Amino acid sequence: LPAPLTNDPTAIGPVLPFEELHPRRYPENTATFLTRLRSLPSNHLPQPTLNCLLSAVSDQTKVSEEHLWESLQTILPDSQLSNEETNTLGLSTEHLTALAHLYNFQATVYSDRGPILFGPSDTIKRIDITHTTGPPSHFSPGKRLLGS
Amino acid sequence: SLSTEATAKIVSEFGRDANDTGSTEVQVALLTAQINHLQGHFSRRGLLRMVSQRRKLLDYLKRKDVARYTQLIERLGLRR
């Protein structure tokens, strides 16, 4: 079990897969990442410097980055929102899954190696987000396909 | 849920007097006792519901008076 997560003051209860705490119809091997129930209210963390996942989702949902970020703070413990990883490498498809649950959409992520689904299927809203390793590793709104 | 006796004891501890049931502190403390009871058996839905409501009450209090919020969460040991 992730030690920072098990000592996170904003969290309560056992460490469990996201989908166990927030059951939806998630694609296989997504929503399996470990987390805990959010207990304490928002600390109003600064938006991440590396925030283009939020910008990409914002473009697609018409929800401001600030609102997306405050929403994440209602469901994930702070240790999962502000840490060494987020500050150096940015947000991840785990955050995307959390947003997809909160805002009831399913995202198709058009990665360098093809489209990947993240978010609950028991939804109507659909969004498109592109990811590339680049460099730099970058999310953006819309579709992208590669091949020969 | 909570017996009338348990409820009364919590109101006494966290409220101004027995009639102070508008107090956010009291409401949060009552939920906490139920939440702790529920984990004591471990209705995962009931647990989420209470944690969620409590979080929103805490948010309400934190926005009004950070110092009261801080004192309350320490008294209840909500920081693990």
Numbering used by the authors:
A (entry chain A): 732 to 879
B (entry chain B): 1 to 42, 51 to 88
What is written in the article reporting this PDB entry?
As for many such viruses, TYMV genome replication is dependent on the activity of a viral proteinase (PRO) to properly process the virus' replication molecules. First, its endopeptidase activity is required to proteolytically process 206K at the HEL/POL junctions to release the 66K polymerase, while a second cleavage at the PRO/HEL junction contributes to the regulation of viral RNA synthesis. Finally, we recently reported that TYMV PRO also displays an ubiquitin hydrolase (DUB) activity in vitro and in vivo, and identified 66K polymerase as a specific substrate of this activity. Strikingly, PRO displays no homology to other processing proteinases from RNA+ viruses, including that of alphaviruses, and the closest structural homologs of PRO were identified as DUBs from the Ovarian tumor (OTU) family.
The asymmetric unit contains a single PRO molecule packing against the next PRO along the crystallographic 31 screw axis, making up continuous PRO helices in the crystal, and an Escherichia coli contaminant (ribosomal protein S15). S15 bridges the separate PRO helices, explaining why diffraction-quality crystals only grew from a PRO preparation heavily contaminated by S15. The continuous helices of PRO in the crystal are formed by the insertion of the C-terminus of one molecule into the catalytic site of the next. Thus, we have captured the N-terminal product complex resulting from the self-cleavage in trans of a viral polyprotein by its resident proteinase. The catalytic dyad Cys783-His869 (TYMV polyprotein numbering) lies at the interface between helix α3 (the first helix in the central lobe) and strand β6 (the last strand of the C-terminal lobe). In contrast, the catalytic dyad of TYMV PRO Cys783-His869 is completely solvent exposed. The last five residues of the substrate 875-Args-Leus-Leus-Glys-Sers-879 are funneled in an extended beta conformation towards the catalytic dyad of the peptidase Cysp783-Hisp869 (where the peptidase residues are labeled in white and the substrate residues in black). Second and most important, we identify the Tymoviridae-specific N-terminal lobe of PRO as a recognition element for surface patches of the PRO/HEL substrate, as this lobe was found to recognize a signature bulge made of the two successive cis-prolines in the PRO substrate molecule.
